[PDB]
Design a protein around this ligand. Structure first.
Ligand code: FAD
Ligand code: NAP
Length: 529
């Protein structure tokens, strides 16, 4: 009666595993869609200079295919964007995935049918499809947050947002400006500084960055990893972050200053943001005195690398909370270069943009041939609201989430039956591929349980969703996060919203949580026959 058992939106990490698991392991008839012309998700769209993974190469991948784990290329310690794209293309090749992906096809609307209990999916070309279940693997790539700057539309030079980075960009002889110093801006600035006539960095808020330590991987090291891949993945599932770290329980202020400086320095040499934050000590994100110790080590490193003390001052975070640092391949070193200028657009904001320059509040005209906007995106739920998703009683996801996202286990939304989110909001804070695998296998097991027991409508209750929001709030309020403003709580509603964007108990406890549900006849889920 319906076109498919399941429809998947997205052909990235999440969508490709959702397709493989439902079609080949559970034998469902499924069609996937993506606006892209190729698989990859964020790794097909984000081809900006310096794009690099946050987790090491041997862990930023799938674990469910052992043959592929052995054949995988481990070139450098972290993996660049074109290599992630080539890997995901290889996954699609090996498992015959593309024949059930409709490319160059965006989904405009998905309407649930409380009669007959399936979903009505319309593409932007007015193609209509029906399916019992809807799998949303949308990521967080929509939509580009561009700087709201007076006159930015009059700029006659090259203007790119890092998410829409065009090929064939050349840098020599050009005066280039970069707005934004987050992870993307740090990666772009570090990669292009040596290639331009002059680089201006327009930073609104300095952030802490630690070295990434991206080194080439020896053939012995690669063989060492593959020989022990089963234990490596077992460590991922029994950890909180899934980054292959020895997650410390050691209190920061329980060692001498000599010892503390040695522990921070060892992680600094090795590289890695989460390593510096969670392999050194166990309370950096929970205790303020511990946090200040981590910051002071990075501030000290900034003041040593950056030789001009006034540029180092400008680069030093004033916030006072190292609530997750970035990673870089030589970011602070860039600012010793004679062709790099740092503009504190907090104490000197960009007021307007003319045809050939960026004007700051001090009147200075910063002449530019190129303006790179590394300015971020919408919130996590932004990708969901940009689709017309109507569930029970015809309520839209825009309205149900007008105050921020909320869900059950990060995978189910009340008033939206038969819809299952992959890497959606209210999920765990950990490495993405292990999270995506955990969710795809749990969702497929639920769909298989429904195909047997002949149930055709699965729905989370308002109580369970609120129980999940409580659990996240209880855990997140134990930490320093929010107070550093990391946009994990985005609430502020008169009757308290406390929409908690992340479950922060770790990947191991997250698998514990959703296992309680699956074991206990899916408590919190409305089953209908
Ligand atoms: C440079 C970079 C490095 C990163 N490194 C790490 C890391 O080391 N560790 C980590 O955990 N995370 C990392 N991330 C985060 C990253 O988003 C996740 O790791 C992962 O790629 C998310 O995969 P996904 O399939 O869930 O979403 P995506 O890769 O974003 O795929 C979403 C796809 O759904 C499509 N789509 C959306 N909406 C619609 C619609 N209405 N119709 C049709 N199609 C649609 C999109 O076009 C997109 O192709 C990194 C991100 C970037 C940009
Ligand atoms: N794993 C990785 O290595 C990696 C790589 C890329 C992205 N990500 C993730 O994907 C998300 C996006 O990363 P992102 O770096 O592109 O965006 P981002 O983290 O949100 O940072 C955006 C930067 O642009 C600045 N900015 C925004 N609007 C501005 C304005 N109007 N004027 C001046 N400055 C402005 C911001 O300054 P303010 O802070 O002052 O607002 C900020 O420094 C992040 O959450 C990140 O975790 C991860």
């Amino acid at each position: 009666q319906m076109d498919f058992d399941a429809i998947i939106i997205g052909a990235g990490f999440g969508g490709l595993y959702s397709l493989k698991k439902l079609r080949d392991d559970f034998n469902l008839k499924v069609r996937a869609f993506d606006r892209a012309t190729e698989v990859g998700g964020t790794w097909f769209w984000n081809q900006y200079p310096g794009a690099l993974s946050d987790s090491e190469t041997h862990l930023y991948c799938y674990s469910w295919d052992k043959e592929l784990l052995q054949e995988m290329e481990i070139k450098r310690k972290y993996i660049s964007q074109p290599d992630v794209l080539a890997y995901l293309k290889r996954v699609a090749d090996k498992h015959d995935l593309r024949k059930d992906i409709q490319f160059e096809t965006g989904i405009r609307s998905a309407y649930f049918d409380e009669e007959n209990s399936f979903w009505n999916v319309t593409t932007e070309n007015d193609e209509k499809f029906t399916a019992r279940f809807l799998i949303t693997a949308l990521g967080l790539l929509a939509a580009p947050n561009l700087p709201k700057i007076k006159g930015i539309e009059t700029f006659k030079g090259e203007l790119h947002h890092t998410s829409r980075w065009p090929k064939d960009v050349t840098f020599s002889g050009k005066r280039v400006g970069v707005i934004g110093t987050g992870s993307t801006g740090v990666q772009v600035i570090t990669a292009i500084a040596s290639q331009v006539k002059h680089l201006t960095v327009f930073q609104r808020s300095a952030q802490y960055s630690v070295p990434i330590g991206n080194v080439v991987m020896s053939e012995t090291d690669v063989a060492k990893i593959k020989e022990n891949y089963d234990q490596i993945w077992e460590n991922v599932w029994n950890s909180a972050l899934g980054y292959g770290l020895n997650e410390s329980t050691l209190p920061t202020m329980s060692v001498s200053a000599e010892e503390r400086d040695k522990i921070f320095e060892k992680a600094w040499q090795e590289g890695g943001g989460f390593r510096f934050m969670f392999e050194t000590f166990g309370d950096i994100a929970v205790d303020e005195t511990a946090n200040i110790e981590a910051q002071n080590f990075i501030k000290k490193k900034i003041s040593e690398i950056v030789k001009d003390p006034f540029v180092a001052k400008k680069l030093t975070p004033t916030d006072l909370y190292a609530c997750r640092p970035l990673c870089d391949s030589g970011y602070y070193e860039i600012f010793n270069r004679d062709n790099v200028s740092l503009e504190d657009v907090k104490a000197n904001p960009i007021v307007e943009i003319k045809e050939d320059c960026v004007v700051t509040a001090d009147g200075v005209e910063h002449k530019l041939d190129m303006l790179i906007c590394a300015t971020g995106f919408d919130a996590v739920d932004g990708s969901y609201k940009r689709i017309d998703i109507r569930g029970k009683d015809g309520i839209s996801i825009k309205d149900h989430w007008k105050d921020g996202p909320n869900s059950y286990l990060g995978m189910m939304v009340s008033n939206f039956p038969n819809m299952f989110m992959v890497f959606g909001p209210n999920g765990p804070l950990a490495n993405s591929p292990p999270i995506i695998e955990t969710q795809v296998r749990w969702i497929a097991d639920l769909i298989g349980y429904a195909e047997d027991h002949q149930i055709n409508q699965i729905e989370a209750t308002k109580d369970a969703v609120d129980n999940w929001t409580n659990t996240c709030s209880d855990i997140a309020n134990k930490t320093l996060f929010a107070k550093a403003k990391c946009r994990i709580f985005g609430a502020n509603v008169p009757g308290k919203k406390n929409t908690v964007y992340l479950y922060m108990g770790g990947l191991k406890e997250y698998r514990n949580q959703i296992s309680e549900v699956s074991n206990n006849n899916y408590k919190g889920c409305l089953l209908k026959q």
